[PDB]
Structure 1
Amino acid sequence: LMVKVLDAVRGSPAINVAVHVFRKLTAEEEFVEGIYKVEIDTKSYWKALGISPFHEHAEVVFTANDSGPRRYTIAALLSPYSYSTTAVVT
């Protein structure tokens, strides 16, 4: 087994390399979850409350609101660049 990546270079590259090599309630086992992962504005209200929640005679009022002036500005995401010009002007 042999893996050769990017053996010879002559210049000014802009690279983003990832190599994985392998040989051989909520449960997880033997995994790889996040590589080069990007999250923006992620929400999660309830999760895995319990084995027996609100079992008998429960009065529940769940109310969720998401509003308001938000703003996101990104010029280059997971994007290598070379010999170029990247700008944000406001």
Structure 2
Amino acid sequence: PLMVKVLDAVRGSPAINVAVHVFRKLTAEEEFVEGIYKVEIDTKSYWKALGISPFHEHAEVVFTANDSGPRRYTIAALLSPYSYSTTAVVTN
């Protein structure tokens, strides 16, 4: 007898994020839940999970990663629910 009750009675305009999980019972992953509420901004990956036996014999490699740039990010209220509020991004 499993009984789960979340936000049974609500009145009055709330701002909500809800995640409810109920469960009764090279790379390998069997059973999982990943990234339910997840934000990636300016994420990088250069060399991931190359095949078996890469560059096995007499390999000559020059690897050069240059992250150099006038990049700008401006964010308000990331994963922040709000109510009866004022959110703004004003430039000049």
Q: How does the TM-score come out when normalised to structure 1?
A: 0.95
Deviations 1:36-85 (A, max 9, x none): 11000000000111111111111111111001100111110111111111
Greater relative contact order (Cα < 8 A, sep 6+) = 1
| Structure 2 unpaired stretches of 5+ | none
In the alignment of these two chains, the number of paired residues is 90
Structure 1 residue 10, shift from structure 2 partner: 1.7
Pairwise CA RMSD of aligned residues? 0.8
Q: How does the TM-score come out when normalised to structure 2?
A: 0.93
Q: Find runs of 4+ consecutive structure 1 residues off by over 2 angstroms.
A: none
More strand by share: 2
Q: Aligned partners of 2:24 and 2:4: how far apart in 1?
A: 13
Q: Aligned partners of 1:8 and 1:70: how far apart in 2?
A: 46
